[PDB]
Design a protein around this ligand. Structure first.
Ligand SMILES: COc1cc(N)ccc1-c1ccc2c(-c3nc4c(N5CCN(C)CC5)cccc4[nH]3)n[nH]c2c1
Ligand SMILES: COc1cc(N)ccc1-c1ccc2c(-c3nc4c(N5CCN(C)CC5)cccc4[nH]3)n[nH]c2c1
Length: 273
């Protein structure tokens, strides 16, 4: 760590504080996470160093010293949450929403092809640069897939597609799709929009660990009401990302081929830094 000069505290993460720092050896400005250590951890994290892709924030170095673990990452200057908040009066233009969605699907398609899932996508860990890029980082209950909320412990890559669908909707409407403040409030916010799931639409749902037959029965709403002026291609894609049954939920790879991306481009955002 004497090889790192802390510049400022970036965040108070899930497993430790994150600082903007300078690597004194290379001169590079990096994001440094101090984890608050298991050997099983070292090996798992050491693998993620290899997982390199333009839409995944790079793990540059893993430093294990004095029974402490420091993870050093590529640094980006802004997160999607900040940008969403800054774009709130006007909205993010559709071409940039589409670009960001496309890129995140590429990142996910890459990760998922290596059997690695994110598990906790949210605007706060999606990072953007001045080039029009958006990147997955860390690779709130608002973005949690229903199978996680229903107690499935062996969930799949589909959980990330759900979270991204929630983020897509939020970019479009400038409001969170399912802003729950408890696990059951989250689940019931989902049910009140998409309908209480049953064995017809989600085979196996009634045997999920935390499923209760006493769940109230709500009817499904029209997507046109849920994500207004989003066009039919967008709503079609969103509907497939938000399928209850994780086995019917669209994959990242299939999503990339959806007609919504027929005219995708890569605009440059206006970033105030
Ligand atoms: C801001 O850095 C960049 C900006 C841009 N735009 C482009 C490239 C880079 C860049 C720079 C360095 C590196 C290294 C690297 N160098 C060293 C090292 N050197 C450092 C040089 N010298 C004093 C002797 C000791 C010592 C130990 C580990 C190292 N790893 N790998 N990849 C790099 C990429
Ligand atoms: C464990 O962290 C990781 C794990 C993995 N596996 C992969 C990546 C990362 C990672 C995380 C963050 C960053 C950043 C960065 N974050 C911010 C930032 N924050 C404040 C608001 N919010 C709460 C978060 C965003 C605000 C301004 C500038 C920033 N730059 N650069 N690189 C990172 C790499």
């Amino acid at each position: 760590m004497e090889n790192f000069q802390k510049v400022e505290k970036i965040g108070e993460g899930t497993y430790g504080v994150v600082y903007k720092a300078r690597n004194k050896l290379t001169g590079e400005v990096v994001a440094l996470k101090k984890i608050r250590v298991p050997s099983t951890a070292i090996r798992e994290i050491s693998l993620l160093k290899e997982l390199n892709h333009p839409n995944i924030v790079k793990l540059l170095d893993v430093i294990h010293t004095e029974n402490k673990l420091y993870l050093v990452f590529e640094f980006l200057h802004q997160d999607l949450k900040k940008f969403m908040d800054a774009s709130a009066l006007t909205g993010i233009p559709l071409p940039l929403i589409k670009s960001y969605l496309f890129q995140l699907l590429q990142g996910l398609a890459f990760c998922h092809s290596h059997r690695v899932l994110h598990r906790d996508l949210k605007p706060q860990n999606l990072l953007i640069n001045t080039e029009g890029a958006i990147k997955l980082a860390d690779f709130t209950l608002w973005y949690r897939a229903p199978e996680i909320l229903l107690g499935c412990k062996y969930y799949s890559t589909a959980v990330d597609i759900w979270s991204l669908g929630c983020i897509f909707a939020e970019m479009v409407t400038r409001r969170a799709l399912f802003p729950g403040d408890s696990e059951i409030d989250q689940l019931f916010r989902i049910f009140r929009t998409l309908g209480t799931p049953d064995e017809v639409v989600w085979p196996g749902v009634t045997s999920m660990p935390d499923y209760k037959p006493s769940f109230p029965k709500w009817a499904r709403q029209d997507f046109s009401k849920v994500v207004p002026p989003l066009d039919e291609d967008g709503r079609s894609l969103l509907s497939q990302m938000l399928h209850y049954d994780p086995n019917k939920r669209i994959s990242a790879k299939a999503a990339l081929a959806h007609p919504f991306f027929q005219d995708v481009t890569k605009p440059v955002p206006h970033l105030r830094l």
